[PDB]
């Protein structure tokens, strides 16, 4: 009874199937994809931020030359300078008036910002996605667990052993590199780490917010301070993390494929919905009700009352219940052209219900699967009118 | 289910169309014109007497 099951990818609406065990009475699923997380295989790269110039106090020799050295510091931009008279606070305070030097240096450093409001580059990889799956089944009636998609793996949570996937429809909607920024995820060709163009994007570029060594292009030039006065010209682009903020892209949760949304937490990609997923579970035997205690519905009728050509259940049929005991009887339609609100009906002995449901065809000829019991509910259908609300319970528009 | 109606002009009878909405249990009417006012634009040009 190892219900295998093919089953689209999409997050929001169960898929209620049915167990057909040869000898014991049937039972309904209820599998309702509560997300579709995904968590590929990363590599943190770089981050970047914007670059402060933490200029170091320039060397004002008053008579004669500072050799400056170039000092480790990430880009670390000094050019010596003569020909200065650097007013500081009482006029002039060198005596000489060319041999009067004056050597700037100044490199580049990670902003206090950059701790916390940084983008951040990936190698984004594959990995493995997930979901917290509820089945709401059978009788059981809960379990609410967090599962894998690779198609060996189980997680008996609740009574059941499921098996998930492998998906067929791969579509990572994260590109190979991925800029990432609080939560605006940029499916962006970075650069690289170790290459920005100053100006362009990533012309700061940190390991990470701890490494003390960058890669810091920001075609940082000094110039000789103005009219002997003590400054610093620090000629600079200001930074490719400043622009990517105000001349960027849109963000992968406003621009992917495919339905997904994004979080920086694992960095996953919510409830993609695309294809199909083949799920086979393995029921607990005890949950099974013999076929011998739920009644025998046969000998019954089924019609339309109220069909709705719809995606809200607004389809409806009436079933003339004809049963041998009185009870439970869990339904489904085998064919995916109806899709059932209702798991399971109570039943007297021999009475009607009618359920809910909805489909995609005007002539809805979708056999009702009434605990070992089938019927053909034909009939005919009506448009709505009022079609703006979030998405279907149909999903099973084909030839019609 | 914006319940379109041609509909004769006469005052003092109802009209008891039906709502068809398809879905949900139809509603009748019952649209009585209980006056037909009219009310022309008009001007005051000279009273006599």
């Known amino acids: 009874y190892e219900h295998t099951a093919v089953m689209p990818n999409k997050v929001g609406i169960p898929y209620k199937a049915l167990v057909e065990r ?3 009475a049937p039972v309904h699923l209820q599998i309702q994809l509560v997300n579709t997380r995904i968590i590929p295989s990363t590599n943190l790269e770089y981050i970047t931020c914007k670059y402060k110039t933490k200029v170091p106090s320039p060397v004002v020799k008053c008579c004669g030359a500072t050799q400056c050295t170039s000092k ?7 050019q010596v300078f003569t020909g200065v008279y ?9 005596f000489c008036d060319t041999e009067n030097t004056q050597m700037s240096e100044a490199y580049v450093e990670r902003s206090e910002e950059c701790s916390i409001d940084h983008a951040k580059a990936y190698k984004v990889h594959t990995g493995t996605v997930q979901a917290m799956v509820n089945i709401t089944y059978g009788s059981v009636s809960w379990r609410s667990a967090d599962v894998y998609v ?8 609740g009574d059941a052993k499921l098996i998930i996937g492998p998906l067929s429809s791969a579509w990572s909607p994260f590109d190979n590199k991925v800029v990432v920024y609080g939560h605006e995820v940029y499916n962006y060709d970075f650069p690289e780490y170790g290459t920005g163009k100053a100006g362009s994007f990533g012309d700061l570029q940190s390991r990470t917010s701890t490494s003390n ?7 940082l030039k000094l110039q000789r301070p103005q009219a002997g006065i ?3 010209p620090f000629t600079q682009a200001p930074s490719g993390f400043e622009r990517w903020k105000r001349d960027k892209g849109a963000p992968l949760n406003d621009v ?16 993609c919905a695309v294809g199909s997923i083949p799920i086979s579970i393995d029921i607990p035997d005890a949950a099974f009700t013999r076929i011998s205690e739920t009644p025998t519905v046969s000998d019954l009728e089924c019609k339309i009352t109220e069909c709705t050509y719809a995606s809200d259940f607004g389809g409806i049929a009436t079933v003339a219940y004809k049963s041998s005991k009185a009870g439970n009887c869990p339904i489904h339609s ?7 609100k209702e798991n399971d009906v109570t039943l007297a002995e021999s009475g009607s219900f009618t359920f809910h449901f909805s489909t995609a065809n005007i002539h809805p000829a979708f056999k009702l699967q009434v605990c070992t019991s089938a019927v053909t509910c034909k009939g005919d259908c009506k448009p709505p009118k009022d079609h703006i609300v979030d998405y279907p319970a149909q999903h099973t528009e084909s030839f019609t």
């Open 230 to 232: 003590v400054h610093t």
């Open 86 to 94: 650097p007013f500081m606070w009482g006029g002039a305070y060198c």
């Open 150 to 157: 690779n198609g060996e793996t189980p997680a008996k949570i």
């Open 22 to 24: 040869p000898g014991y």
């Open 334 to 340: 085998p064919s995916g052209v109806a899709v059932i």
């Open 72 to 78: 480790p510091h990430p880009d670390y931009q000094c």
């Open 256 to 271: 992917a494929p495919f339905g997904c949304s994004i979080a920086l937490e694992p960095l996953r990609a919510e409830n």
């Open 213 to 219: 060594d960058l890669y810091a292009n920001t075609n």
